[PDB]
Amino acid sequence: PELEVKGKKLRLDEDGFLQDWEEWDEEVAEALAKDTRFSPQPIELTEEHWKIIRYLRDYFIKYGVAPPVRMLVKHCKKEVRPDCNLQYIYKLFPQGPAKDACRIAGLPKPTGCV
Missing domain, CATH: 3.30.1420.10 (DsrC protein, N-terminal domain)
Structure with missing residues (x-):
């Protein structure tokens, strides 16, 4: 498409x-x-969304793959809110970190965002 x-x-x-x-x-x-x-x-895309997108994009350029969900949560806790959790990530990205966040961050595939 x-x-x-x-x-x-x-x-x-x-x-x-x-x-x-x-x-x-x-x-x-x-x-x-x-x-x-x-x-x-x-x-x-609020400031909170953009913190996540920037992290994901930077990780992908550095390390060559999407980060695992574990790493996204680890970042959301420090830079978004300390109580961040998977519910909050899905509030921000309703189809989830793979289908929405990696997609919006311009990764070619969601491979590894698990």
Whole structure:
């Protein structure tokens, strides 16, 4: 499938993930967050969402894969709220960290976000 952002026709897979992952930026993230082809609950990206997205993206660029959910929770506890837990991650990202957060962060696959 395609996602057109700022004139660029970006390739998605059939789960909505950005295959042209190197083209991601904050406007692409917004487009992905609002992409109702791939979610029935489009998201507003609050400061809390953006802390998670930035961590996930940085992890993927450094380490080459999505982080496990364990690591996302470890970050959410320090940088979002100390009581963060899986319920809170799903409040932010209703389809979960793999299907929503990794997708919005522009990873090409959710592989490893478990």
